[PDB]
Amino acid sequence: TLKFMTASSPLSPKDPNEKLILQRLEKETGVHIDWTNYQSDFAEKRNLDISSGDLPDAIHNDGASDVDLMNWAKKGVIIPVEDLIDKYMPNLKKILDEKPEYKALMTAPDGHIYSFPWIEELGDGKESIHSVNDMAWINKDWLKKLGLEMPKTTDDLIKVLEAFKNGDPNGNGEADEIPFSFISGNGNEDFKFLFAAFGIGDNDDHLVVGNDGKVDFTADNDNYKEGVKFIRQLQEKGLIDKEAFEHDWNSYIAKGHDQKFGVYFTWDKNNVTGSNESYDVLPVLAGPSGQKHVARTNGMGFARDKMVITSVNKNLELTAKWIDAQYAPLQSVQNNWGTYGDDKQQNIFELDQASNSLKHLPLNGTAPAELRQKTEVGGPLAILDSYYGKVTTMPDDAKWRLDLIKEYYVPYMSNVNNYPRVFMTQEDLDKIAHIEADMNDYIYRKRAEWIVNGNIDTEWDDYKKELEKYGLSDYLAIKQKYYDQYQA
Numbered sequence: 405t406l407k408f409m410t411a412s413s414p415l416s417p418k419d420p421n422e423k424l425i426l427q428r429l430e431k432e433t434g435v436h437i438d439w440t441n442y443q444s445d446f447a448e449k450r451n452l453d454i455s456s457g458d459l460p461d462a463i464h465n466d467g468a469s470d471v472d473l474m475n476w477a478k479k480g481v482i483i484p485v486e487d488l489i490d491k492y493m494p495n496l497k498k499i500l501d502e503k504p505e506y507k508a509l510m511t512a513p514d515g516h517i518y519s520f521p522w523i524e525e526l527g528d529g530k531e532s533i534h535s536v537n538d539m540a541w542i543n544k545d546w547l548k549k550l551g552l553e554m555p556k557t558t559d560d561l562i563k564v565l566e567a568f569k570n571g572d573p574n575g576n577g578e579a580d581e582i583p584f585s586f587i588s589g590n591g592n593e594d595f596k597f598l599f600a601a602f603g604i605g606d607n608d609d610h611l612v613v614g615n616d617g618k619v620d621f622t623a624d625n626d627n628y629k630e631g632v633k634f635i636r637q638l639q640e641k642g643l644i645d646k647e648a649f650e651h652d653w654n655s656y657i658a659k660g661h662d663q664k665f666g667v668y669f670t671w672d673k674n675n676v677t678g679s680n681e682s683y684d685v686l687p688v689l690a691g692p693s694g695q696k697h698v699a700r701t702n703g704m705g706f707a708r709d710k711m712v713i714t715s716v717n718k719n720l721e722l723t724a725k726w727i728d729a730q731y732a733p734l735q736s737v738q739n740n741w742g743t744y745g746d747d748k749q750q751n752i753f754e755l756d757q758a759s760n761s762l763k764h765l766p767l768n769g770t771a772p773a774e775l776r777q778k779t780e781v782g783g784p785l786a787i788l789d790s791y792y793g794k795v796t797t798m799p800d801d802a803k804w805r806l807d808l809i810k811e812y813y814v815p816y817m818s819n820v821n822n823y824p825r826v827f828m829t830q831e832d833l834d835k836i837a838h839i840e841a842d843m844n845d846y847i848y849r850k851r852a853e854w855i856v857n858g859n860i861d862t863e864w865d866d867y868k869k870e871l872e873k874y875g876l877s878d879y880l881a882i883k884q885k886y887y888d889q890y891q892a
């Protein structure tokens with residue numbers, strides 16, 4: 405018996421032990437987990453537990469930031485685990501011996517390892533499945549219906565959206581068409597993907613790496629100004645979803661499912677407009693001066709912390725062995741993606757007993773993300789490029805996305821490098837975190853304000869000064885420092 409805090413989807417059972425995977429796991433391991441399972445606001449609820457001294461044995465599927473992780477280590481909330489890996493975790497050792505770069509990625513600059521990672525190999529470099537998150541999707545049915553060609557430029561896009569607005573492409577005599585929509589902020593449904601059509605573009609870090617080796621701050625660039633102006637034009641012309649700055653995922657996908665969107669953003673259309681050929685990828689567009697670019701995210705198939713062990717943990721050896729069971733290939737694949745042989749609900753896999761390998765089943769039009777979030781576990785695991793065809797099939801939705809990324813975006817990803825996943829010192833993390841406490845929401849708040857009020861030209865210099873007062877220069881110097889050490 406161990407006590408784990410975890411994070412899961414609101415679609416999944418309130419008690420994680422209702423998951424088929426965890427049932428089978430308790431049989432296999434003989435460990436029963438008592439779960440504290442937060443399904444909304446995990447990070448905030450976790451932090452209250454930590455602040456009140458109400459710690460589990462370990463926090464599963466945690467996803468803490470680096471600053472959190474180091475703060476917790478310094479205050480003795482969590483423990484270093486490297487001795488536990490050496491002594492009790494042969495599955496993990498195997499992985500780290502085959503792919504030693506993950507060990508580097510796990511290790512803090514004080515020399516300790518504080519967390520167990522998630523590793524999922526799907527594409528490399530520019531071809532990473534993570535290279536673009538908020539892909540743009542377009543209603544090709546409407547285009548074909550209105551006699552329109554796929555737009556090639558930002559100007560074409562405006563015209564297409566105007567025709568969507570006024571042209572009644574769904575043919576019901578109603579102005580029900582929402583030409584352009586998004587969910588504003590970080591994440592897969594934001595519009596920042598289009599900013600690159602004005603050069604450089606933007607990502608959730610607001611940080612790219614120039615081909616000069618200089619870290620660039622995106623959200624102060626004239627190019628970024630132009631991107632905001634473009635979205636403002638869309639606003640002024642009545643082409644943006646009237647609730648874009650208010651709605652949520654559930655509302656976004658309700659409209660999606662009714663196919664109200666002309667152009668919208670998401671990871672995979674199948675989750676929002678469904679599994680049809682009405683919507684396809686919006687190809688990379690040329691800006692007005694011929695800019696044609698895809699900004700790279702800094703995302704990768706690695707998250708440093710999907711589990712930590714607290715300093716109250718009862719049985720370090722038992723914990724460490726339980727965790728290592730998650731790194732066995734079959735377990736890792738399932739924990740990540742779902743399972744087989746549920747006699748009562750849909751299954752992501754079938755187990756082929758002849759090979760003892762997993763195989764992706766077709767979904768009867770069920771959303772990718774929907775069944776997954778019900779049946780996955782998250783937590784620490786590894787899926788290596790050598791598992792495909794031997795331990796498991798590659799997901800078809802993954803393969804498909806990798807193809808799209810390679811076909812539509814890679815040619816226009818002209819930045820040789822993105823920002824590497826460094827592990828900064830505690831002091832530097834703390835410094836950075838203070839700065840981001842000001843910048844982060846300020847950056848989104850002004851972006852939205854300018855789209856809605858049209859005053860970017862008169863507020864831009866003052867916004868840049870404000871960003872300097874928050875410490876943007878110190879922030880960049882720190883970023884650049886770690887990028888330079890990484891390259892050396």
Ligand SMILES: OC[C@H]1O[C@@](CO)(OC[C@@]2(OC[C@@]3(O[C@H]4O[C@H](CO)[C@@H](O)[C@H](O)[C@H]4O)O[C@H](CO)[C@@H](O)[C@@H]3O)O[C@H](CO)[C@@H](O)[C@@H]2O)[C@@H](O)[C@@H]1O
Binds near residue numbers: 413467671672780802
């Ligand atoms: O294209 C399919 C392949 O893409 C991957 C890339 O890792 O999976 C992406 C995918 O699932 C991610 C998932 O979790 C994310 O969203 C959570 C909700 O906030 C968040 O807690 C996780 O930390 C974050 O990783 O999203 C779904 C739904 O939440 C969940 O079940 C997943 O763990 O993203 C799309 C939805 O945004 C999904 O369609 C897709 O699975 C790779 O795993 C896939 O093979």
Ligand SMILES: [Ca+2]
Binds near residue numbers: 572573574576580581
């Ligand atoms: Ca209509």
Ligand SMILES: [Ca+2]
Binds near residue numbers: 620621622624
């Ligand atoms: Ca800049």
